[PDB]
Each structure stands twice: as C-alpha cells, then as structure tokens.
C-alpha cells in the first residue's frame, strides 16, 4: 500500500473497501480504537470532521467530532492555523459517507497541496469513516451524543435542509 500524502510513512490504520477507490476508509471499530487511545503513543491528535448539516449534527454526533459542513469553515478551522503534533490524522464522514464526507476530504487535500511546497502537507493522512454516522451509531451509541440519529431527509427538517444549502458555495 502507498505511503501517506507527504510520502513520509505508511498509513497507520487498517482500512476497509469504500466507494471512492482512491480514498482510504476505516470501520467504526477503528474509529473507536482511535477514541479509546489504542494509538496514543503514535497519534498526537486526530480530528473527526462531521460534514453533515447542523441539524443532523445536533440530533446526534460522534463524541468530540467538529461540525464543518461548509468548505470555507472546514478550511478556516483546519488550515488557517494548522493543527501540529507523532502523527496528526483527520477522519471525515457524513450521514452515509458517500458524498459530503468524501467531497470535503478531497477539498481539504486540494487546499493543503495549494498552500504547501510539494509534497509537504499539514494533513498527509486522512480517512473516510465507512458507512458514516448511519452505520456508526448502531455499533457504538455510547460514543455518540446525544444518543440518537437524525437523517438528512428527516421529515421535520425539510426547511432546515433548504436553509443550509443556500449557504453552500456550489450546488
Ligand atoms: Cl460550501
């Protein structure tokens, strides 16, 4: 398997197959391994980037995850003052981790390359949480807060969905 983005070392985590063939996916179990410190002697810090809309995040998210659905906010939070360390790892996800999560993962790499001299990167190692929150919650409810799951298409949040989308850069 290839080295991480700045070609400094191998990817640390075991991966699983995912739709986007060039991206690296991890399972809920591996996400819990990170959260429980199984890699604490090697990983200085990791950030779970929840790319879902605010109402989805508010209805139940992974403990410590940061909600950064808008590209400009994800870029500001991660690249205005890069999180330095040991390894730093980013894990992106959305509801199913099919579109929003993968898109943000690609966007951040694009921006990371743009502000660096090749092949250096602030975030050389990034993963997608396979199955997104939809598959994580049924496996590890006590690693979520609140302990619930609100789908993007929830019937009571149709207006909230529209309101949020009109704030995005492109549709
Ligand atoms: Cl956006």
From Swiss-Prot:
Task: Give me the disulphide-bonded residues.
Answer: none
The Phosphoserine modification is found at 81, 170
| Residue span(s) of domain Rhodanese | 42-145
Q: What terms describe the molecular function in GO for this protein?
A: phosphoprotein phosphatase activity; protein kinase binding; protein tyrosine phosphatase activity
Q: Which UniProt keywords apply?
A: Cell cycle, Cell division, Cytoplasm, Cytoskeleton, Hydrolase, Mitosis, Phosphoprotein, Protein phosphatase
Localization, per the record, is:
Cytoplasm, Cytoskeleton, Microtubule organizing center, Centrosome; Cytoplasm, Cytoskeleton, Spindle pole
Q: Which domain of life is it from?
A: Eukaryota
Record-stated family:
Belongs to the MPI phosphatase family.
Complex and partners: Interacts with MAPK14 and 14-3-3 proteins.
Which protein are we looking at? M-phase inducer phosphatase 2
Q: Which gene encodes it?
A: CDC25B
């Amino acid at each position: 398997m290839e080295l991480i983005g700045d070609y400094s070392k191998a990817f640390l985590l075991q991966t699983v197959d995912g739709k986007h063939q060039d991206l690296k996916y991890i399972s809920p179990e591996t996400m819990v391994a990170l959260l429980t410190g199984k890699f604490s002697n090697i990983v200085d810090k990791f950030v779970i980037v929840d790319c879902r809309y605010p109402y989805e995040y508010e209805g139940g998210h992974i403990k410590t995850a940061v909600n950064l659905p808008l590209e400009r906010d994800a870029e500001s939070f991660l690249l205005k003052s890069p999180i330095a360390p040991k390894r730093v790892i980013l894990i992106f996800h959305c509801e199913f981790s099919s579109e929003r999560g993968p898109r943000m993962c690609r966007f951040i790499r694009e921006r990371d390359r743009a502000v660096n001299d090749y092949p250096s990167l602030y975030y050389p190692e990034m993963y997608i949480l396979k199955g997104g929150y939809k598959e994580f919650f049924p496996q590890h409810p006590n690693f979520c807060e609140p302990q619930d799951y609100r789908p993007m298409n929830h019937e009571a949040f149709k207006d909230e969905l529209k309101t949020f989308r009109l704030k995005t850069r492109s549709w």
